[PDB]
Design brief:
Two copies of one chain form a homodimer. By secondary structure, chain A is an alpha/beta fold. Chain A has one domain (1-346): Alkaline Phosphatase, subunit A. Helices cover 30% and strands 22% of the residues of chain A. Chain A contains twelve helices and 14 strands. In chain A, strands 5-6-4-3-7-1-8-13-2-14 form a ten-stranded mixed beta sheet, sandwiched between helices. In chain A, strands 9-12 form a two-stranded antiparallel ribbon. A two-stranded antiparallel ribbon of chain A has the order 10-11. In chain A, helix 9 (201-213) packs parallel to helix 11 (238-262). Chains A and B meet through helix 1, strand 2, strand 11 and strand 12 of A and helix 1, strand 2, strand 11 and strand 12 of B. The complex binds magnesium ion (4 copies) and zinc ion (4 copies). Residues 15, 55, 230, 234, 275, 308 of chain A line the site of one zinc ion. Chains A, B: Mg(2+) 1 binds at residues 14, 108, 225. Chains A, B: Keywords: Hydrolase, Magnesium, Metal-binding, Phosphoprotein, Zinc. Chains A, B: Mg(2+) binds at residues 14, 106, 108, 225.
């Protein structure tokens, strides 16, 4: 008989396997917020058609609770729309939010508010935002709203659906407190990398979402994504990968700090899949004649692929109901477990 | 307040990171015994001097509860001998056993019964067995006992210490039930690979250990090692690694079946470190005008290093006190957690 969380925060590190997570224990100043977690599980990430998942089916597993085909956005294997956790939350009087460091129309955020046959339909996904139940969002992707191939001004449609939109910068809570809904579109495409000075966007936007969505003692659901960990993996770029997941761990600390103060909030941290075969290998030293040998004293990150991989992925959970997330299970059970512990009407 | 296990079985898969574990979910017929576990933790594996651990310091962390230098066997970072869980168990009237698919003198088993300044001293390690409290062992390494630089016959010495020794084959339990202590040395060096027909030695020997040590209602501690998973990794040989870890998972099943019936047995499964950067990457195909592309429908295992890596490592625990093993901690705490739940004293 587990406790029942009022609020849920789901943080997704795109492309972070256990090796990526491990880098925070070696390449971050201070202890990782990961260490606050006790309840840990493992998910199997394959899609309905492919051993190696993409981000679209991976996120749809979490958001909708079904295995589906790579590239699907909130649709089942037969392409029909399926009810998402955000749509359920709305029907249970729960305020909802989505934060991302990619475009807001990218596969991960999109799976939580849109229904599209293919993740590539990003202008369609943007239009879907205007019909969604979301109360808050923050990310990049201004292009998909204001510079579209179909020349439509979707920004105007957003605002005509009760969204207050800021395209300049994240503000503080008091700035937005009296708005019905709030949207931040802070880049034309993806947000800047950490190495290009994105700073504490992910944490700040998550903290802002929490304050905005908990107005009037309301319960809330938030999904925040460390989107660019995946891109570091694809590029086989260690410093990129490392700086992005270090930022994600900061966001974890933000969520957990709120949850510990609040006492009624479940925080779930997981990834959609691993990418790059990132490995914390021994540093390579080079001698005069003999060239290369391994030095176990230090780490030199290596990669083995430019794409995703099918390893099981760690799930971390803190707060009321967090015990439900231990053991080993299919990725789509994340959805069913959130539904189970919150006791929301399906 | 968790429960107190009477018996402990510690199964060590040498060199198995979560990616290696994940292979059983794709390359083994039927569901992996890993799925029986609910309580899961993670360990950091660095040694006292090295970010990337070797098998000797990694295992000594488990057996003796301290961080020590790579190559150390049952000694602290300052080289002083430290009491092992086997020695502590003996003091508490617990029966003990060690099983491995490597030579029984290899770093992992050695760390549970010997104290040596360097893991390479395997003839010294074999002699250390004679002054040990071990009641049961099974593995390769006959050469270290009978073809030595000092030309001593160590089997004779063991027999004087109440050991019955078998160098022919694993036998039925009825063949050893009345022996005071039992040792099986079934190969000159390492046991054959699974690919070369080792068969169910690891599961069979663990079952034999259990039945033998639990004679007369004595409590027991057993360490059984899937030794050759690591060697598959070093060689970057996917079929080798996979077949060895599938065998290990069978041994997990053997242990769990016993523990579930017994009800007073804690089973802990973990690894000393990862090796080879093993990755369940997408299958690679070639065109013939810019060859390589990915097919996400299938897995093509890959590696990025010939050595170990420093990723955190999953810990699985089942039985009384299993909840003590969740969260994230240093590898050497495995020792302290075992002592905590068993209440085995010093
Ligand atoms: Mg993503
Ligand atoms: Mg770089
Ligand atoms: Mg070993
Ligand atoms: Mg092979
Ligand atoms: Zn992804
Ligand atoms: Zn990707
Ligand atoms: Zn090892
Ligand atoms: Zn090794």
């Amino acid at each position: 008989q587990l406790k029942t969380p009022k609020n849920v925060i789901l943080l997704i590190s795109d492309g972070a396997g256990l090796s990526q997570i491990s880098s925070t224990f070696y390449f971050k100043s201070g202890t990782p917020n990961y260490t606050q977690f006790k309840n840990i599980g493992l998910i199997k990430t394959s899609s309905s058609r492919e051993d190696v998942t993409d981000s679209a089916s991976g996120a749809t597993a979490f958001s909708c609770g079904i295995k589906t085909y790579n590239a699907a956005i909130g649709v089942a294997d037969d392409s029909t729309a399926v009810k998402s956790i955000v749509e359920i939350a709305a029907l249970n009087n729960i305020k909802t939010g989505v934060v991302a460091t990619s475009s807001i129309t990218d596969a991960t955020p999109a799976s939580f508010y849109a229904h599209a046959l293919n993740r590539g339909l990003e202008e369609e996904i943007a239009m879907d935002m205007t019909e969604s139940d979301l109360d808050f969002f923050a990310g990049g992707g201004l292009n998909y709203f204001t510079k579209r191939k179909d020349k439509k001004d979707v920004l105007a449609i957003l605002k005509g659906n009760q969204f207050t939109i800021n395209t300049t910068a994240l503000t503080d809570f008091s700035s937005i407190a009296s708005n019905r809904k709030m949207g931040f579109l802070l880049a034309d495409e993806a947000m800047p990398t950490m190495e290009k000075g994105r700073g504490n966007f992910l944490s700040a936007a998550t903290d802002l979402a929490i304050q905005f969505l908990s107005k009037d003692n309301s319960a809330f659901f938030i999904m925040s994504e460390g989107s660019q960990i995946d891109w570091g993996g694809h590029a086989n770029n260690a410093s990129y990968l490392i700086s992005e997941i270090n930022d994600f761990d900061d966001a974890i600390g933000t969520a957990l700090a709120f949850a510990k103060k609040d006492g009624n909030t479940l925080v779930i941290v997981t990834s959609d899949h691993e990418t790059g075969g990132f490995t914390l290998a021994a540093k390579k030293n080079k001698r005069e004649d003999g060239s290369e040998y391994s030095d176990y004293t230090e780490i030199g990150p290596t990669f083995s692929t430019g794409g995703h991989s099918a390893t099981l992925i760690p799930v971390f959970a803190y707060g009321p109901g967090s015990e439900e997330f231990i053991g080993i299970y299919e990725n789509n059970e994340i959805f069913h477990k959130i539904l189970k512990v919150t006791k929301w009407n399906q």
